[PDB]
Ligand binder design. Structure first.
Ligand SMILES: CCCCCCCC/C=C\CCCCCCCC(=O)O[C@H](COC(=O)CCCCCCC/C=C/CCCCCCCC)COP(=O)(O)OCCN
Ligand code: SF4
Ligand code: SF4
Ligand SMILES: [Zn+2]
Lengths: 115, 176, 96, 112, 48, 125, 208, 371, 97
């Protein structure tokens, strides 16, 4: 039961197809984005960041969530291609100015009360 | 009712056509605008000689904040926290405790003037005329830190501006 | 009634003064510290006690609508004096 | 005939009675295919028949404007094509059928 | 004062050349006016 | 035209919440208790959702109270406990639910004040 | 009712009730409820599938001809199964009246775009998507219109924090504006203003 | 204000024009939900900051409709008088800034002197030059000072000559005409469908004015004419705005002559705060002052959409009440939003220099567009 | 205005109007900055009797909206939301500009 209305895909396979299309488009766009924005990162680590962002949502098991994430990624790609962003928006993906938050129990115990 | 702004029909008789042609060829309206500007040059300018001359103001004007006190010399504030509750910008911070003589008085009264919107809600919420918005407006500052007023600064402002503040309140209090 | 800290700072009417080991004193070096010279408690202590021949007196702080809300004070207790909750003025029945 | 109706983009239509009659005939023909019990069909038929009888009994154009309560016969004609297009779209939609489904239990409960 | 001037220019102040601790022959500003003359000078009242 | 998929709802990846503010927080689902200073009961009708309290420290300047958690002032209202539980589950927050406290009915009797032999007899009124 | 009380108009109430009944009769497939408020406002509750038919009927019908889209917005109610309600405000110049149409949806169910019916709905639907995350199908170009580029989340949702999650500043080491987790020198003070002793008996709910 | 404008140009002609907004998005609607109604009032001053008291009036009317109360007659007359003054201010700003962008730049100063005088009126009535917060959801905060009406009459009897000088500089100038005539033409049907309002509607020949069809405060007790255009271009809209300035002068004269006596806020101390002397002498007045300035007044549950004829068009608010003293939702409708949305259509097949004229004739302020 | 006669004539001719009648600089014609105290009238509700608040309580007269055609629970002439708007009149004060 639990009948719901499709957004774009009827099942998971079409969702995977759209995900692969978006990943292909991003993988093409990475070098041109790196050159045009005069970024200090390399193409390798930019594509690694794209891979990491795609892996961040690897646990989704619902076509509606999957293709809505695809829609948001397509919006981000459109923003990046049309040079609507500045270097700051692109560089925000890397968090180069944020201190590295430790994970072990001792470090969190020493720094403060935050688990 | 309604009017028409651009619903005229130009006359097509020979005299009107010749008049429009003369307007086109001799630039009559341009000369008329030139004459308007020339005439407007020969009239007295509206500039005042600041800072030696000041712009007109009103007893209702809202300027820099100040804390007042009674003629006996004790501060009017009783830490009711109505001004802090009504503040649209959350710019007032208040802490209180009983005094050495048991009076209900504040130990902390801060106003962040970089958050304040100068709406005057605090002085109209005050039940004892303690917090007011004085007539001073020439208090620009070279650093962000000096625009964070504490209780001592506000009491100093009250002692500094009490004469004008009292005169303005005497002028305007019958409208409140 | 401004006092001075043993280190050298002025003590405010709220009693605030940085202790010796406090680093936050560095904000006042090459500058000053804002302290109001008139203490309300001392100023209100100098006011004379009013003598009225009634058991209940009313106080509005003086000035009519320019004072505080009008309150009534009971003066039956001869041990102490009646003190206004807003203005701090003191009233007393004519003992002896 | 008048000129410059006063609305930008709305041109003057000479011989408007024929246009109104043709549009009303088309509207009635499209309404004929709708089920009889549909409220839309009977209501729009009543309105269209009223307007057609009104226009068939008045040769003057200004008196027709005053009687039809719309004024500026050109915009009445515009409303006529709007109604015709809506009739075709609604015949395609078929809204006389019962409600698709009820909302959840407290979908419209306010406050909270 | 000069009531024949238009509103705004009918009152003015000539600043002192030496206030509390600095030489104000050239460096004058509007914060040097005391509150009572501040009230009179900004036309908040008609009485000096 | 209908997927008819069967899986629990999860919108976590779409809300934009940071990673460490989802699985680390602990929301509380409760009916707020009546303020004992007053006898009114109008504030004990709905269900509230609030997050766990985090660190608050004193600002070195002005001595103000600073914070670092953006959810320190977030409070939500729900008609029933089920709605709050469903919202918390679909948003991915671990929750504790407290059952509503209802004042039990009481037997009041004005005549019990003036008792012939019972202890309920009052000394004054 | 002495001068401090607002005057009530009976004629407009009856007219709006009659027109609501008329609209309900003509479109039973979608209309779920019709209401007229005590200050003479008519709002109509419809099923999500009927957004295009109802709007087209109200715009094009001779008796309605609501040619102007006054406003389109959304309201977030977390306690409902369908989280968001979509509100359309329409103005009729021919008959000098205003109508309201309400719809509902959740995070994952799209709503049909009404740009074909009203050209004004374009930026309104863009803003609804930006602020609430409600997707609109067959929209010409749906994208953020108000938030910053790369902004994550939808701020007008009730569970979004007031100050957000990230703040901006300039860093001299990287010579650019950077985004960092938000820290406030003074936390926003939360006030509990709601009082007991309910104010309006007419709105009292059953004790269930 | 500040605008980012991405466009495609084929030679001189503009093919596509895509405006990017949000550079002044402050999140006002979410901030309003954390305030009481009185606390949320000053946001409307900042929404459209050329016509402040008009936004105050719209919000006050919405709250009054939800509260089932009405302001006293003198309050309504004061509201309409200051709304017409604010309309004069807004039209001066719009016309002079449009001319400045074209390149005239002299009438800007000429009319900003008058704008300064009207700011003096604002400051005298509320103590603030622009964000007064004078119009409240129960009436007005304070009564006018004893000499204000005379000064308003003195100001308003010389403004027609200033408008005449403006027209002498701009109306019949051939450069101004060639800059504004047949630019940004919009049809009546497109204007209606695209959501336009105000002058943007009336320039195409549509006869619509919210002060006439749906009057709100006392606008049905004064008579004035509504300028109507014929070609739907920038020149017709400029003429309409000038004629609206003249009609505003007419309404100001009528308001000055017919000001009635009485109180200024509704005599209901559960909505409007009591006078200071009452608060300082009466127990009930003190209790009501305390509760009104700490918690605020509760508004019965319900939703309303209230619109007024603002100087820039139809300004509306969709206000939702949950029964508490804080609004549950407050949607703000700004005409500049729809006008900037239609900018793309209005600049089809025009020069690059005509986009500035179209933006000027749309009368766009980004505070209300972004909110 | 302390302007000479020749300058007044020149500016009047160049502008085309008589400026001295309507000057844009304020002079003694404005009101004085000090005013007498204002008495200020009380509201209608200031009665001592026959003034119970339950008879003048606007908020408590608000009611939930009336429900018509709740779906969960003849000639029949066609109707419109409101009578058609009357056409405006052509401003018999200045019909054309
Ligand atoms: C039997 C003997 C006959 C001998 C022949 C003599 C006959 C002469 C009769 C006519 C001569 C007049 C010609 C003078 C120049 C005319 C140029 C002209 O008219 O062009 C205008 C344009 O001219 C201008 O508008 C230029 C103005 C630019 C603004 C600059 C302001 C100038 C005004 C200030 C006065 C200048 C003073 C000049 C004298 C300088 C002294 C050294 C046309 O433009 P439109 O109105 O758009 O119409 C065409 C499209 N359908
Ligand atoms: S003037 Fe307004 S914003 Fe400023 S402190 Fe007073 S209440 Fe707060
Ligand atoms: S300043 Fe006035 S309102 Fe604020 S706490 Fe003190 S007495 Fe209360
Ligand atoms: Zn006292």
């Amino acid at each position: 039961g639990t009948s719901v209305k499709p957004i774009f895909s009827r099942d998971m396979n079409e969702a995977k197809r759209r995900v692969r299309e978006l990943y292909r488009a991003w993988y093409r766009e990475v070098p041109n984005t790196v050159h045009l924005f005069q970024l200090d990162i390399s193409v390798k680590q930019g594509r690694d960041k794209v891979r990491e962002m795609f892996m961040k949502n690897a646990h989704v098991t619902d076509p509606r969530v999957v293709d809505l994430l695809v829609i948001k990624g397509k919006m981000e790609l459109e923003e990046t291609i049309n040079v609507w962003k500045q270097r700051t928006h692109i560089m925000r993906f890397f968090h180069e100015t944020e201190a590295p938050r430790p994970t072990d129990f001792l470090s969190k115990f020493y720094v403060g009360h935050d688990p | 009712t309604y009017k028409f702004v651009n619903m005229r029909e130009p006359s097509m008789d020979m005299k009107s056509v010749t008049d429009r042609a003369a307007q086109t060829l001799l630039w009559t309206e341009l000369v008329r605008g030139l004459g308007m500007t020339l005439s407007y040059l020969f009239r007295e300018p509206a500039t005042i000689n600041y800072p030696f001359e000041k712009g007109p103001l009103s007893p209702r004007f809202r300027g820099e904040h100040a804390l007042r006190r009674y003629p006996s010399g004790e501060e009017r504030c009783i830490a009711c926290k109505l001004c802090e509750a009504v503040c649209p910008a959350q710019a007032i911070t208040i802490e209180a405790e009983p005094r050495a003589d048991g009076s209900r008085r504040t130990t902390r009264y801060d106003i962040d003037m970089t958050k304040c919107i100068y709406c005057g809600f605090c002085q109209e919420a005050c039940p004892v005329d303690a917090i007011v918005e004085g007539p001073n407006f020439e208090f620009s500052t070279e650093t962000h830190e000096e625009l964070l007023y504490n209780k001592e600064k506000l009491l100093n402002n009250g002692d500094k501006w009490e004469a004008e503040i009292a005169a303005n309140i005497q002028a305007d209090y019958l409208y409140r | 009634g401004v006092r001075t800290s043993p280190t050298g700072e002025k003590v405010t009417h709220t009693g605030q003064a940085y202790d010796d080991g406090d680093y936050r004193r560095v904000r006042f070096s090459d500058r000053q510290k804002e302290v109001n010279e008139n203490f309300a408690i001392d100023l209100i202590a100098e006011q004379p006690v009013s003598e009225v021949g009634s058991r209940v007196i009313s106080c509005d702080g003086g000035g009519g609508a320019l004072g505080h809300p009008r309150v009534y004070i009971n003066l039956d207790k001869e041990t102490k004096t009646g003190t206004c909750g807003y203005c701090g003025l003191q009233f007393r029945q004519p003992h002896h | 005939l008048k000129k410059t109706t006063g609305l930008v983009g709305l041109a003057v239509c000479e011989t408007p009675h024929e246009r109104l009659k043709i549009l009303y005939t088309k509207i009635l023909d499209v309404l004929g295919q709708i089920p009889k019990n549909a409220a839309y069909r009977k209501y729009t038929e009543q309105i269209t028949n009223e307007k057609l009888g009104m226009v068939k009994a008045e040769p003057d154009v200004k008196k027709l404007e005053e009687q039809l309560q719309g004024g500026q016969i050109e915009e009445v004609i515009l409303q006529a094509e709007n109604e015709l297009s809506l009739a075709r779209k609604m015949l395609r939609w078929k809204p006389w059928e019962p409600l698709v489904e009820e909302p959840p239990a407290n979908q419209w409960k306010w406050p909270i | 004062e000069d009531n024949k001037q238009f509103f705004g220019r009918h009152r003015w102040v000539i600043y002192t050349t030496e206030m509390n601790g600095r030489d104000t022959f050239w460096d004058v500003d509007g914060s040097m006016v005391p509150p009572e003359w501040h009230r009179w000078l900004h036309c908040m009242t008609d009485d000096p | 035209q209908l997927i008819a998929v069967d899986e629990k709802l999860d919108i976590t990846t779409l809300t934009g919440v940071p990673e460490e503010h989802i699985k680390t927080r602990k929301v509380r689902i409760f009916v707020p208790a009546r303020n004992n200073m007053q006898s009114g009961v109008n504030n004990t009708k709905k269900w509230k959702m609030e997050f766990d309290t985090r660190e608050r420290w004193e600002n070195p300047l002005m001595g103000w109270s600073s914070t670092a958690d953006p959810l320190s002032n977030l409070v939500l209202t729900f008609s029933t406990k089920e709605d709050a539980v469903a919202f918390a589950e679909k948003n991915g927050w671990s929750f504790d639910v407290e059952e509503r406290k209802v004042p039990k009915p009481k037997s009041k009797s004005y005549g019990a004040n003036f008792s012939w032999n019972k202890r309920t007899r009052v000394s004054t009124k | 009712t002495r001068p401090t009380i607002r005057p009530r108009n009976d004629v407009v109430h009856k007219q709006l009730s009659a027109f609501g009944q008329y609209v309900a009769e003509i479109l039973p497939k979608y209309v779920q409820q019709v209401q007229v408020s005590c200050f003479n406002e008519l709002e109509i509750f419809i099923h999500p599938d009927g957004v295009i038919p109802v709007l087209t009927f109200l715009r094009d019908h001779t008796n309605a001809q609501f040619k102007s889209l006054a406003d389109l917005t959304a309201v977030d109610v977390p306690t409902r199964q369908n989280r968001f309600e979509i509100v359309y405000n329409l103005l009729s110049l021919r008959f000098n009246s205003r109508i309201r149409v309400k719809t509902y949806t959740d995070e994952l169910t799209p709503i049909e775009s009404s740009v074909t019916v009203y050209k004004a709905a374009n930026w309104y639907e863009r803003e609804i998507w930006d602020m609430f995350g409600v997707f609109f199908a067959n929209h010409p170009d749906l994208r953020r219109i108000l938030t910053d580029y790369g902004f994550e989340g939808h701020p007008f949702r009730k569970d979004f924090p007031l100050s957000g999650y990230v703040e901006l500043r300039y860093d001299d080491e990287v010579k650019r504006v950077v985004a960092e987790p938000v820290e406030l020198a003074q936390e926003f003070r939360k006030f509990d203003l709601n009082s007991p002793w309910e104010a309006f008996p007419a709105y009292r709910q059953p004790p269930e | 204000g500040v605008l980012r404008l991405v466009m495609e140009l084929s030679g001189e002609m503009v093919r596509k024009c895509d405006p990017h907004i949000g550079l002044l998005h402050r999140g006002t609607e979410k901030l309003i939900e954390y305030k009481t109604y009185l606390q949320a009032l000053p946001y409307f001053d900042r929404l459209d900051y050329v016509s402040m008291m008009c936004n105050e009036q719209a919000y006050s009317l919405a709250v009054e409709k939800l509260l089932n109360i009405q302001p006293p007659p003198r309050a309504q007359w004061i509201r309409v008088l200051f709304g017409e003054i604010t309309r004069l201010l807004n039209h001066i700003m719009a016309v002079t800034t449009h001319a400045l962008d074209i390149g005239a730049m002299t009438p800007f100063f000429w009319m900003f002197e008058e704008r300064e005088k009207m700011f003096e009126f604002y400051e005298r009535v509320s103590g603030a030059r622009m964000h007064a917060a004078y119009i409240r959801p129960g009436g007005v905060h304070q009564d006018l000072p004893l000499g204000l009406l005379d000064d308003i009459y003195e100001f308003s009897k010389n403004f027609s000559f200033r408008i005449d000088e403006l027209e002498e500089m701009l109306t019949n100038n051939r450069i101004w005409r060639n800059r504004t005539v047949d630019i940004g033409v919009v049809t009546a049907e497109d204007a209606l469908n695209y959501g336009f309002s105000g002058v943007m509607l009336r320039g195409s020949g549509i006869q619509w004015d919210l002060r006439k069809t749906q009057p709100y405060d006392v606008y049905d007790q004064v008579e004035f004419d509504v300028p109507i255009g014929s070609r739907g271009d920038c020149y017709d809209r400029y003429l309409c705005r000038v004629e609206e300035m003249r009609q505003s002068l007419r309404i100001i004269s009528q308001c000055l002559n017919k000001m009635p006596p009485g109180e200024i806020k509704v005599d209901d101390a559960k909505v409007s705060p009591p006078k200071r002397a009452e608060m300082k002498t009466s127990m009930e007045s003190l209790i009501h002052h305390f509760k009104l300035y700490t918690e605020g007044y509760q508004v019965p549950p319900g939703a309303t959409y209230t619109a007024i004829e603002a100087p820039k068009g139809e300004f509306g608010v969709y206000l939702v009440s949950d029964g508490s003293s804080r609004p549950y939702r407050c949607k703000i409708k700004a005409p500049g939003f729809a006008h900037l949305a239609g900018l793309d259509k209005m600049s089809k097949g025009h020069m690059l220099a005509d986009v500035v004229a179209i933006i000027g004739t749309q009368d766009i302020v980004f505070g209300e567009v972004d909110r | 205005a302390s302007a000479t006669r020749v300058i007044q004539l020149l500016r009047n001719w160049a502008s085309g109007r008589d400026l001295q009648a309507k000057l844009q600089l304020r002079y003694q014609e404005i009101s004085k900055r000090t005013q007498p105290p204002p008495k200020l009238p009380v509201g209608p509700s200031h009665k001592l009797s026959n003034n119970y608040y339950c008879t003048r309580d606007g908020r408590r007269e608000a009611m939930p909206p009336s429900i018509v055609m709740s779906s969960q629970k003849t000639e029949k002439k066609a109707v419109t939301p409101a009578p058609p708007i009357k056409r405006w009149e052509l401003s018999k004060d200045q019909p054309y500009l």
